[PDB]
């Protein structure tokens, strides 16, 4: 169980991941999103101690957390981030340009606290320099994150990279030989293969048809957390569900949900995901550390405009059959008669919520997966 300072920053990282998932939903270039709330805290956390004066307190306003001291907020961050770490691979790095010498001080306790590892890197051979980083992310994850950026655009600064694997382990799971090649429509005249994995059981469900959504919670491994997923009746753009999601209707969605036969359908794969933070954690508040000429990024170094250049939060969620194994012929006789249709074969949103602590571990959507695109084809069965 968290402490009350670490639950009560885990209560604004979930409201911050909201915030930011909301940010990025506007973007038009933004396609599949994924953001752990406590990774994008600890992100905030390291500016705090590396910054100073104005650079620093925009990071504790950020996090609501400017009425407490530094090595009370580091201690929660640090704590929230002991709590994910019990499937789940995540891994730190801060990479500064070659010239640039971190401090001491500094190094000593962000690997205390956020297990922050530091790297200097130049950015004149670019070929070599996003080399580096995308090996240290593909051996983060074992190579289930291989690239990470193609391109780094702001080459005169300091880089936290943040890699990020998660499996969803089911709590009952899904037969390995129930999957087969299916269609997702993007659009509804676009449509890409994928492989898609099924079954059939008792879940949390509830049909919004005043507002046209499907909302259901399947739990994970020993039900201490669920992904709970929502989408709408038809093929449309999120922007729609996005508008209602908030943290108090999902309470009200979540409410209204009842155990009922569900036969669901999900998409079976890996969906790598690369978000540089540092335009949206503008918006935010933090505005000093992003810009060249403002930042006070002393404590860090003690270098003459060292900039937060980017905030990489990579990350690769797999969706797969394993899980603990269901006790086959259960009372299902009747009970599995009509199940509710969740055909998952469209963009959809997804929460990754702890049943004990309450704290939000993930939130993305999924509207473009890795697959081909389909097609001039009018060839009927």
Same mark, same amino acid.
Not at 346 to 354: E, K
């Given at each position: 169980?968290?402490?009350?300072?670490?639950?009560?920053?885990?209560?604004?990282?979930?409201?911050?991941?909201?915030?930011?998932?909301?940010?990025?939903?506007?973007?038009?270039?933004?396609?599949?999103?994924?953001?752990?709330?406590?990774?994008?805290?600890?992100?905030?956390?390291?500016?705090?101690?590396?910054?100073?004066?104005?650079?620093?307190?925009?990071?504790?306003?950020?996090?609501?957390?400017?009425?407490?001291?530094?090595?009370?907020?580091?201690?929660?961050?640090?704590?929230?981030?002991?709590?994910?770490?019990?499937?789940?691979?995540?891994?730190?790095?801060?990479?500064?340009?070659?010239?640039?010498?971190?401090?001491?001080?500094?190094?000593?306790?962000?690997?205390?606290?956020?297990?922050?590892?530091?790297?200097?890197?130049?950015?004149?051979?670019?070929?070599?320099?996003?080399?580096?980083?995308?090996?240290?992310?593909?051996?983060?994850?074992?190579?289930?994150?291989? /690239?990470?950026?193609?391109? %780094? !655009?702001?080459?005169?600064?300091?880089? $936290?990279?943040?890699?990020?694997?998660?499996? *969803? &382990?089911?709590?009952?799971?899904?037969?390995?030989?129930?999957?087969?090649?299916?269609?997702?429509?993007?659009?509804?005249?676009?449509?890409?293969?994928?492989?898609?994995?099924?079954?059939?059981?008792?879940?949390?469900?509830?049909?919004?048809?005043? /507002?046209?959504?499907?909302? %259901? !919670?399947?739990?994970?491994?020993?039900? $201490?957390?669920?992904?709970?997923?929502?989408? *709408? &009746?038809?093929?449309?753009?999120?922007?729609?569900?996005?508008?209602?999601?908030?943290?108090?209707?999902?309470?009200?969605?979540?409410?209204?949900?009842?155990?009922?036969?569900?036969?669901?359908?999900?998409?079976?794969?890996?969906?790598?995901?690369?978000?540089?933070?540092?335009?949206?954690?503008?918006?935010?508040?933090?505005?000093?550390?992003?810009?060249?000429?403002?930042?006070?990024?002393?404590?860090?170094?003690?270098?003459?405009?060292?900039?937060?250049?980017?905030?990489?939060?990579?990350?690769?969620?797999?969706?797969?059959?394993?899980?603990?194994?269901?006790?086959?012929?259960?009372?299902?006789?009747?009970?599995?008669?009509?199940?509710?249709?969740?055909?998952?074969?469209?963009?959809?949103?997804?929460?990754?919520?702890?049943?004990?602590?309450?704290?939000?571990?993930?939130?993305?959507?999924?509207?473009?997966?890795?697959?081909?695109?389909?097609?001039?084809?009018?060839?009927?069965?």
């Amino acid at each position: 169980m968290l402490s009350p300072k670490a639950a009560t920053l885990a209560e604004r990282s979930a409201g911050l991941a909201f915030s930011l998932y909301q940010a990025m939903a506007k973007d038009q270039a933004v396609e599949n999103i994924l953001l752990s709330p406590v990774v994008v805290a600890s992100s905030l956390g390291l500016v705090s101690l590396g910054g100073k004066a104005t650079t620093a307190s925009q990071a504790k306003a950020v996090l609501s957390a400017e009425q407490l001291r530094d090595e009370e907020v580091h201690a929660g961050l640090g704590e929230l981030l002991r709590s994910l770490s019990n499937t789940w691979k995540l891994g730190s790095r801060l990479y500064g340009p070659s010239s640039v010498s971190f401090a001491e001080d500094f190094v000593r306790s962000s690997k205390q606290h956020y297990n922050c590892e530091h790297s200097k890197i130049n950015f004149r051979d670019k070929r070599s320099a996003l080399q580096s980083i995308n090996e240290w992310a593909a051996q983060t994850t074992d190579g289930k994150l291989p /690239e990470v950026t193609k391109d %780094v !655009e702001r080459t005169d600064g300091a880089l $936290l990279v943040n890699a990020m694997f998660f499996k *969803p &382990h089911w709590d009952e799971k899904f037969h390995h030989k129930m999957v087969d090649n299916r269609g997702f429509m993007v659009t509804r005249s676009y449509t890409v293969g994928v492989t898609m994995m099924h079954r059939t059981g008792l879940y949390n469900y509830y049909d919004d048809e005043k /507002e046209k959504l499907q909302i %259901v !919670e399947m739990p994970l491994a020993h039900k $201490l957390s669920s992904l709970i997923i929502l989408m *709408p &009746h038809h093929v449309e753009p999120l922007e729609r569900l996005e508008k209602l999601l908030t943290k108090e209707q999902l309470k009200i969605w979540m409410g209204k949900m009842q155990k009922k036969a569900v036969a669901i359908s999900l998409p079976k794969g890996v969906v790598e995901v690369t978000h540089d933070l540092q335009k949206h954690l503008a918006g935010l508040g933090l505005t000093e550390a992003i810009d060249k000429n403002k930042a006070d990024l002393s404590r860090m170094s003690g270098k003459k405009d060292l900039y937060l250049a980017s905030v990489f939060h990579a990350t690769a969620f797999e969706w797969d059959t394993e899980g603990n194994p269901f006790d086959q012929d259960i009372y299902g006789r009747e009970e599995l008669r009509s199940p509710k249709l969740f055909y998952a074969d469209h963009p959809f949103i997804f929460l990754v919520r702890d049943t004990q602590s309450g704290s939000l571990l993930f939130i993305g959507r999924l509207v473009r997966p890795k697959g081909d695109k389909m097609r001039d084809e009018l060839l009927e069965h």
